[PDB]
């Protein structure tokens, strides 16, 4: 319940995500945009990311299960996930999607199944870490503490 240690732990946790490559510097852009004029901005953008990506992953899963795989139906989903991940700084999801697009180009169905599994693993990882980040922030704020603003 030490708020100073909670805040230091939150900084260290965030730093770990960058070191591990789960987030890249684009995530910091989002944190920089969150201020008194835009108070829950990061969580709002990330929640939209999860809503959209949940839907894309379910659509992609159906498309790869079909008897004849229509790759013109598949690629736009991989493209959208690549773009969304890039824009919130989910670097490992983005990189998995880059590889996926390569195997979509080559029409390689077995490789695509493997790529889908990898994207899901990376997506669930970054979802877990970001949900936890917001939980830690909310705890501190509800206890009368504060998250210092990213002034980078």
């Amino acid at each position: 319940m030490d708020l100073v240690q909670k805040q230091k732990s939150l900084q260290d946790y965030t730093k770990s995500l960058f070191l591990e490559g789960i987030l890249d510097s684009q995530f910091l852009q989002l944190q920089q945009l969150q201020d008194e004029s835009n108070p829950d901005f990061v969580s709002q953008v990330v929640t939209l990311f999860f809503q959209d990506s949940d839907r894309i992953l379910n659509d992609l899963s159906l498309s790869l299960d079909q008897q004849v795989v229509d790759f013109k139906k598949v690629d736009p989903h991989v493209h959208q996930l690549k773009g969304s991940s890039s824009s919130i700084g989910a670097q490992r999801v983005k990189n998995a999607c880059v590889v996926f697009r390569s195997f979509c180009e080559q029409q390689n169905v077995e490789a695509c199944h493997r790529c889908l599994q990898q994207v899901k693993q990376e997506y669930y990882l970054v979802k877990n870490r970001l949900e936890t980040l917001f939980k830690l922030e909310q705890q501190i704020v509800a206890s009368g503490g504060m998250i210092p603003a990213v002034e980078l």
Binding site: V45, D52, H79, G83, S87
Partner: protein
């Protein structure tokens, strides 16, 4: 007379991020989600700047830009009409937003009539650099 800006982008996450960045820079934008919507907006308002995503459904930003340039040259939308677009001397600055693929080189943006480009993901500094050159 605040500058009028049009953002053309199909990805909703990309829109939310670009909107907040532009707001912090002191600007609001109209939003179009594909090239047809861009042409509809451009036909009905006079913009000072257009930020044009390259890859979009229905009509992509490269074709949309060519059609807008044809309109600027001839004074009508007949190129757009022939290309299937439904439609009811002051050159628009059009800035591509590109996605790091072979299908989106800067030279290709230029070859379809775009003036400049920003490499995605959009950042505050990339937008700032662009606005300081193209908005007065």
């Amino acid at each position: 007379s605040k500058p009028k800006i049009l953002l053309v982008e199909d990805n909703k996450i990309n829109i939310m991020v670009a909107k907040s960045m532009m707001k912090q820079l002191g600007h609001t934008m109209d939003i179009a989600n594909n090239g047809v919507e861009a042409i509809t907006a451009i036909n009905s308002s006079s913009y000072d700047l257009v930020l044009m995503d390259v890859c979009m459904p229905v009509l992509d930003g490269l074709k949309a830009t060519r059609l807008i340039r044809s309109y600027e040259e001839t004074g009508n939308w007949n190129a757009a009409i022939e290309a299937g677009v439904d439609i009811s001397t002051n050159r628009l600055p059009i800035i591509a937003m590109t996605a790091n693929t072979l299908a989106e080189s800067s030279e290709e943006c230029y070859a379809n009539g775009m003036d400049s480009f920003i490499s995605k993901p959009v950042t505050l500094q990339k937008l700032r650099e662009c606005l300081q050159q193209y908005l007065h």
